[PDB]
């Protein structure tokens, strides 16, 4: 496990990092601390640490407290080996349509949702651990567009509300090698038949 060459460095930022289409931001293990962008509370007007435009990728960062409004993803994004040490309002939001994959990494201390889906998308969480969270995935409340969520090799500990919540009857959640400890209720969807294994 060659840890990255920026490991032990801390980057203090005062504005959102914008990653453009076709660009990959590779932090090489850098820890990011945002200043002036939010306190990581549940206040809904914090800034994102990263804005990933459509077709942008992000890898190998640690997001330190304050988690602010985390990572905004505008579709067709891969987010690989990102560690949220203390999730802010949420960890990652899907803001526009496309495929978004979170592969590797982990999240801890989400007072409410880790992943927030606000546009129709295909959303995959793979090889991921999260501890002390309200929900792993939430589709924006009272919306009825379609998301399809895949949880593959995911381990969850201490889930206060549920693994995933959606108010959309057309949305679907598919899981494969999902391990959950200390969780209220697994899935808050209009019908449990929207949830499938594979």
Ligand X SMILES: O=C(O)[C@H]1O[C@H](O)[C@H](O)[C@@H](O)[C@H]1O
113/154 with CB nearer ligand X: 113
Q: Is 69 in the site for Ca ion (CB under 5 A)?
A: yes
Torsion angles phi and psi, residue 62, rounded to 5: -115, 125
Q: Which of residues 20-79 bind ligand X (CB under 6 A)?
A: 44
Q: Is 140 in the site for ligand X (CB under 6 A)?
A: yes
Give buried/exposed letters for 153-190 (b at 16+ CB in 10 A, else e): bbebeebebbbbbbebeebbbbbeebebeebeebbbbe
Interacting partner of 112 out of ligand X, Ca ion, none (Cβ under 5 to 8 A depending on kind): Ca ion
Q: Which tokens in the block code for residue 159?
A: 């889930």
Compute the least distance from the CB of residue 109 to Ca ion, in Å.
4
Could you give the CA distance from residue 172 to residue 148 in angstroms, rounded to a whole number?
A: 5
Q: Which stretch binds Ca ion (CB under 5 A): 39-47, 55-63, 157-165, 166-174?
A: 39-47
**Identified binder of ligand X from the candidate list 77, 116, 139, 168, rule CB under 6 A:** 116
Compute the least distance from the CB of residue 132 to Ca ion, in Å.
8
Compute the least distance from the CB of residue 173 to ligand X, in Å.
18
Could you give the CA distance from residue 167 to residue 190 in angstroms, rounded to a whole number?
A: 6
CA angle 115, 120, 121 (to 5 degrees): 65
Number of residues that bind ligand X (CB under 6 A): 8
Q: Is 172 in the site for ligand X (CB under 6 A)?
A: no
Taken in order 127, 71, 54, 96, is the CA torsion positive or negative? positive
CA angle 83, 85, 91 (to 5 degrees): 70
Binding-site ranges for ligand X (CB under 6 A): 44, 89-90, 93, 116, 118, 140-141
Binding-site ranges for Ca ion (CB under 5 A): 42, 69, 86-87, 89-90, 109, 112
């Amino acid at each position: 496990h060659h840890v990255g060459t920026n490991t032990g460095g801390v980057l203090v930022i005062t504005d959102t990092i914008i990653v453009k289409s076709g660009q990959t931001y590779d932090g090489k293990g850098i820890k990011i601390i945002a200043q002036g962008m939010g306190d990581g509370s549940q206040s809904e007007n914090q800034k994102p640490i990263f804005k990933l435009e459509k077709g942008a990728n992000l890898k190998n960062v640690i997001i330190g407290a304050p988690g602010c409004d985390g990572i905004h993803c505008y579709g067709d994004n891969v987010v690989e080996n990102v560690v949220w040490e203390d999730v802010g309002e949420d960890a990652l939001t899907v803001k526009s349509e496309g495929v978004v994959e979170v592969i590797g990494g982990s999240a801890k201390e989400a007072a409410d949702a880790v992943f927030q889906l606000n546009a129709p998308c295909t959303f995959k969480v793979k090889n991921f651990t999260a501890t002390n969270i309200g929900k792993l995935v939430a589709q924006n409340g009272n919306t009825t567009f379609k998301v399809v969520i895949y949880l593959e090799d995911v381990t969850l500990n201490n889930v206060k509300s549920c693994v995933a919540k959606s108010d959309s009857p057309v949305s679907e959640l598919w899981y494969h090698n999902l391990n959950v400890n200390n969780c209220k209720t697994l899935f808050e969807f209009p019908s449990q038949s929207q949830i499938h294994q594979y």
